[PDB]
Design an enzyme around this catalytic site. Structure first.
Site, short mmCIF file in Angstrom:
data_model
loop_
_atom_site.label_atom_id
_atom_site.label_comp_id
_atom_site.label_asym_id
_atom_site.label_seq_id
_atom_site.Cartn_x
_atom_site.Cartn_y
_atom_site.Cartn_z
N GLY A 184 3.21 6.23 9.46
CA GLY A 184 4.71 5.97 8.80
C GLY A 184 5.42 4.72 9.08
N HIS B 178 0.68 -1.26 0.15
CA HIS B 178 -0.05 0.16 -0.07
C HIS B 178 0.95 1.30 -0.03
CE1 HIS B 178 0.61 0.13 4.35
NE2 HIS B 178 0.65 0.99 4.34
N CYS C 170 4.65 1.65 8.96
CA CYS C 170 4.63 0.49 7.98
C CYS C 170 5.84 0.09 7.43
CB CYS C 170 3.61 0.86 7.02
SG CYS C 170 1.85 0.57 7.62
#
Ligand SMILES: *[C@H](O)[C@H](C[C@@H]1CCNC1=O)NC(=O)[C@H](CC(C)C)NC(=O)OCc1ccccc1
Ligand SMILES: *[C@H](O)[C@H](C[C@@H]1CCNC1=O)NC(=O)[C@H](CC(C)C)NC(=O)OCc1ccccc1
Lengths: 306, 306
Positions: A143, A41, A145
């Protein structure tokens, strides 16, 4: 002596964290050999994420739309592809600081260290357990991820987790490094359902053994119990059923303490039915279940890595 | 979201851990530039340690009696000396992996990360607070001496602690890196007395602020209190007195939450007099005091190091 929740030394993993940018989303990637791994993503905008068609979104992207940064130096993407929920970016340079590593899919009840990262830069390390319902109780902001969870055996880093999302319950969900989610979760911004969580019984016993090794011995009692007698009490209290294979895993801890395992189950049974009466065990007023028997033996002596 | 006890990434410190041997005692040293720092009781035998005359013991030693190993490669001691309770070994090679660093003497109530080491090899990392009575609640086995505690601001490593001993109470004592003990302790194997420990009130408030930031909001109440009204309750419960300077340190947390600090003290007062009634705060049944206000703000957003 003493007993603390201990993470693995993070040096080997720090050298593998990079920044991956694509659009306005920036997150963390893992740079091993000449491949960068990150959540897919990263290719979504804020509207895509409610129901993204990832294949159609990736098609609109080319190699040069993927900005990968390691510190201030940088790689070029000579190839990209999607494996399940992770993106693999083939890049110019093989990471000079690549540790010996494997990718592993861990089992419920196992623990690992999480290196929390922002903008490709390590920020802190802590220990987590994969819950029975395939969530973790983490500490993750926007942030974060692409931060990864790992174990160290040897000089060998076993990566087991990449962080993807926070469920409206507040706990956290992610994939293995082949991009398959732990649990039923999908990477879209939708209300998603974790199952009932259960307590990891074999981990609680291991922590009671650690408590005895460290002088906390009051809960030790007079009674004993049978396996199915205990398992009846376990399901009353949403504890995962105890099996003979769990007993044998506890064997080492039983032999160092001289306390039979179902002697230990009897103490656990009375803690569950009578509470702690405002006393504490290893400085906690709750039964702790995020220590595996190996964690206990490691910390209680061994505790040594390349 | 979420809140976890988080250590600093340990990579910068891992590269500085060496093995120091002298006699049969082996422990850990810290290799910065061309100097190795380790506890001076590496020069004791098992009988010396009850009342060692360190000056007379060091005199019988020469440079070549000090075996220092970094991995499998190694330095030679071109000079030795005793500063307070630490030995400084001048060595051949300046550590190529020396980080930017300072030596700092931290204050009671501050926290730091501990890199637990055995035989010069890093083993695990966890967060500790310097207690009001200048002890820490650690996890240390034989061989762990010379493990160090540190903070990271920047790329700059601030070393604040070197581990020396376990008191028969079970908590741990050590020096700053100039070799001065925190607290009244001496490095001999004698029953030694830590003072009454007090709870770090300003840290408990910061954790209550973290709890509100993270959705745990039940303890928030109706009452308010005055500073000295609260300080009367604090001394009932062995909490360190709250000052106006503590209030101002909490200012940021107060302004992000919209909860006045003495509104927060009133909730803390009722928790102390009424207990938690079997509920929990950030997954704990006890009031947690090993988070500073800076720890909370770091974790709750910022949380980024070289
Ligand atoms: C990736 O950086 C981010 C991690 C979230 C951010 C807040 N706490 C986390 O763990 N993941 C997402 O934002 C994720 C993206 C989907 C396409 C998978 N959506 C998500 O987790 O929604 C929950 C949430 C979003 C923003 C704030 C708080 C929770
Ligand atoms: C240094 O490696 C060692 C660390 C102790 C070992 C057990 N847990 C620790 O934190 N320090 C000592 O052994 C120390 C040496 C004196 C000369 C300072 N003596 C000590 O701490 O006695 C307490 C103790 C010794 C052995 C086992 C358990 C506690």
């Amino acid at each position: 002596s003493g007993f603390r929740k201990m993470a693995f030394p993070s040096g080997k993993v720090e050298g593998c964290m990079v920044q991956v940018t694509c659009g306005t989303t920036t997150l963390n990637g893992l740079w091993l050999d000449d491949v960068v791994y990150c959540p897919r993503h990263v290719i979504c905008t804020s509207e895509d994420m409610l129901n993204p068609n990832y294949e159609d979104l990736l098609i609109r992207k080319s190699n040069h739309n993927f900005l990968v940064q390691a510190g201030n130096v940088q790689l070029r993407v000579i190839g990209h592809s999607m494996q399940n929920c992770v993106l693999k970016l083939k890049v110019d340079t093989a990471n000079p600081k690549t540790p010996k590593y494997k990718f592993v899919r861990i089992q419920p009840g196992q623990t690992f260290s999480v290196l929390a990262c922002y903008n490709g830069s390590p920020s802190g390390v802590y220990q987590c357990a994969m819950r029975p319902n395939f969530t973790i109780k983490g500490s993750f902001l926007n942030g974060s991820c692409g931060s990864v969870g790992f174990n160290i055996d040897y000089d060998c880093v076993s990566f087991c987790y990449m962080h993807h999302m926070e469920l409206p319950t507040g706990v956290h969900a992610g994939t293995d490094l082949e991009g398959n989610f732990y649990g039923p979760f999908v990477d879209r911004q939708t209300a998603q359902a974790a199952g009932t969580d259960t307590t990891i019984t074999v981990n609680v016993l291991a922590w009671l053994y650690a408590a005895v090794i460290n002088g906390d011995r009051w809960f030790l009692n007079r009674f004993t119990t049978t396996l199915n007698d205990f398992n009846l009490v376990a399901m009353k209290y949403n504890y995962e059923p105890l099996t003979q294979d769990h007993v044998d895993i506890l064997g080492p801890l039983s032999a160092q303490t001289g306390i039979a395992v179902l002697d230990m189950c009897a103490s656990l049974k009375e803690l569950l039915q009578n509470g702690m009466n405002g006393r504490t065990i290893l400085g906690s007023a709750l039964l702790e279940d995020e220590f595996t028997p190996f964690d206990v033996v490691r910390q209680c002596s061994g505790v040594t890595f390349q």
